[PDB]
Structure formats: C-alpha cells, structure tokens
From a paper:
D-lyxose isomerase (LI, EC 5.3.1.15), is an important aldose-ketose isomerase reported to catalyze the reversible isomerization reaction between D-xylulose and D-lyxose, as well as between D-fructose and D-mannose and several other D- and L-sugar substrates. The overall fold of TsLI is a cupin-type β -barrel, with two α helices at the N-terminus, followed by the cupin barrel made up of two antiparallel β-sheets. The conserved manganese binding site is located within this pocket and is co-ordinated by the side chains of residues H75, H77, H143, and E88.
The structures of the native TsLI and the D-fructose and D-mannose complexes have been determined and refined to high resolution of 1.7, 1.4 and 1.6 Å, respectively. There was strong electron density observed at the conserved cupin metal binding site, which was identified as manganese by the metal coordination and metal ligand distances. The metal identity was later confirmed using a X-ray fluorescence scan at beamline IO3 of the Diamond Light Source. The β-barrel forms a deep pocket that is predominantly hydrophobic. The loop containing R175 in TsLI does not appear to change conformation between the non-ligated TsLI structure and the structures of TsLI sugar complexes. The dimer interface of TsLI is largely hydrophobic and contributes to the enzyme stability at elevated temperatures. The disulfide bond in TsLI is sufficiently buried to hinder the interaction with reducing agents, such as thioredoxin or gluthathione, allowing the disulfides to maintain their oxidized state.
Residue numbers in the entry:
A (entry chain AAA): 0 to 175
B (entry chain BBB): 0 to 177
The structure:
Amino acid sequence: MMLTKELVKEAREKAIRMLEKACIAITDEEKEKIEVTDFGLGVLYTFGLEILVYVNNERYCAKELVMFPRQICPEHRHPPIGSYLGKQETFRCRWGEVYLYVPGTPTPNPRARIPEEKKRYFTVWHEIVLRPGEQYTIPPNTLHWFQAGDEGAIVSEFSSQSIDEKDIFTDPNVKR
Amino acid sequence: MMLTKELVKEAREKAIRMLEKACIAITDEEKEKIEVTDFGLGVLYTFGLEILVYVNNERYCAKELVMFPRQICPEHRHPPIGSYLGKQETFRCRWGEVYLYVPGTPTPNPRARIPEEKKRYFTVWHEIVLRPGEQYTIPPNTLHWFQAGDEGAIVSEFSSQSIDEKDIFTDPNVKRIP
Ligand SMILES: [Mn+2]
Ligand SMILES: [Mn+2]
C-alpha cells in the first residue's frame, strides 16, 4: 500500500474538517500545505500524522498536529544536530485526546493499542494522557510516541527549531 | 483608576468567556492565572491585555493574547538583553481582528483609533491588519503596537524566550509589572 495523491487529498480534507470542528481558522494557502505522512509504512490510518506548520525558523516553531482516530506517531526522538541541542517541544492537546508515551516506569493498563507485530518498535511505556488544555514537555533527544483516542485528537506543538529530516525512529522501516 | 482584585477578576472572567467562544480549552488552574495588565495607565478597557502563557522557557514561548473590543497594547519593543538577541515573535490572529503597527511608511486612513492625547506615544504607523488565520513576524528590538477591532481579538504569540520585564515602552507612564 502506498501514499497516493488521492489518499493525501482525502487525508487533508479530513484534517481540515477536524480543524474546522475545533474552530481553528486556517487559510486557503495553509489548507493546501497540510503535510500528510504515513512515515513510509503504507498504513496511513494506523501509522500517520497530518501537520499544519504555523511557523518554523532557527529560533522557534509552532505546529498543529491532527490525528485521526487511533492514528499512531511511531517512536522517535529529536537529536542534537551539529551544535544545535536538538528540538525540545511542548504539546498541548486542543481537541479529543492523545496517549503520549515517554521514558519511565511502564504504566499498567496503557490506553494505546499497537499492532502486535509492531510492538517491538515501541520501547517507552510511561503514559501521559492529554485531554483538551493539558500539556507535557519532552526534552531534546528523548524517545516518545503517541496515539490518538477513538475520536482522534488535535495537539499543538510549541518548540525550538524543527528539523524533521533528522529525527531518529526506532522502527527501521520508517522513512519520515 | 488603579487595578483592583475585583477589576482583575472581572477582566479574567470576560477573557475566559472570549476563549470559550473561540472554542479554546483552558484548564481551571490556567483560568486563575490569566494575566490582566492595564500597563499602569489606569484605563484597562482602553490600554490593556489579558494573557494566557502556554509555555515560556530559554528556548521558546507561546501565549494567547485576549483583547477586549478596541483594547490597545501600547508601543514597545523587545530588546537584546546581554548576549540574548531579544525576543522575535510571530502573531497569528485566531478570532476577531487586530490592527498591528510596525516601522515603515505610515499607512493612510489607519483602522486604529487612539486617544488624542496619547498619540504622541505611538510612533510607528505602518499598518498590518490580521484577520483569523493570518500571521505576521516582528524581528527583535522592533517598535510595535496593536489594537483589537470592534469585536475584540484573540491573537496567538509564538516566539523565542519572553522577558516581559525588559520590554521598553515609548510611553514613559507605562509600568508593565503591576
Ligand atoms: Mn516529537
Ligand atoms: Mn511584542
């Protein structure tokens, strides 16, 4: 299965509707530029993310992450690059709910549900549940992953410079 | 007149309602912590701002600025501090509309309406109108001010580290720290 132009358009339209439902104004030019990634894994609705970048420069970045129901962001970390410390980010759930996993003691009875054969590539299990208004901050170079709840989620990212191409994923099949 | 605890509570409640109308979730703990400033000028509803800080650290900052109808943020700039370049910020109008003024050729027929006797302390007049979804970025140490439209405005800030206490205002009557 492959990320086609038709799948991308469908995903953009779904994400645009979710943003509208959450009352988040988006320009026509931004609507066209929403990034759709299946992380190269060919199952967008299982592993994938729809991203609106508000601003990204050498000094700060802000994005809106849209997630369809139970969409999963595969495990990654944002490493130092040259003398750049690496991206630190704060997430704020805006709508729906998200299950975020970071290093720490495994939480019993985690909310996330991962395909059995992909569990090997999820290694952190300390759970943070974020509902609308709630936040959490990930230091640079820290492993993390997240899955939206059964209605999906919109999660804001506020961070230092983003360099998506340099992110390191646990799953060696991922191409960002 | 001075900013009392009752005036602060009233302003917080109004700003909370405006956030709810814009569907922006805020926690009970954030409701108590919204900053209300009249910039020390004693006319909150003319000059003033209601601020929710989402995050502010050495590496980045994000805030929600709530503005009542025609509330004005007095002219200031975010200067370098030591070796810190100074705050760069991007504004994004979320709701309502805002009239932002930056250095440049004065725009004829500006939308803003400033009290006659305070005009002397507004020195930049190049107009940027932001409606919901629209953004503008102010480089560090750049003079700027803004006024909300007749329905008010909610404006997001995304920026490098914020150090409000170091901001320099054109109006010498302003005290940022209440
Ligand atoms: Mn991340
Ligand atoms: Mn400013």
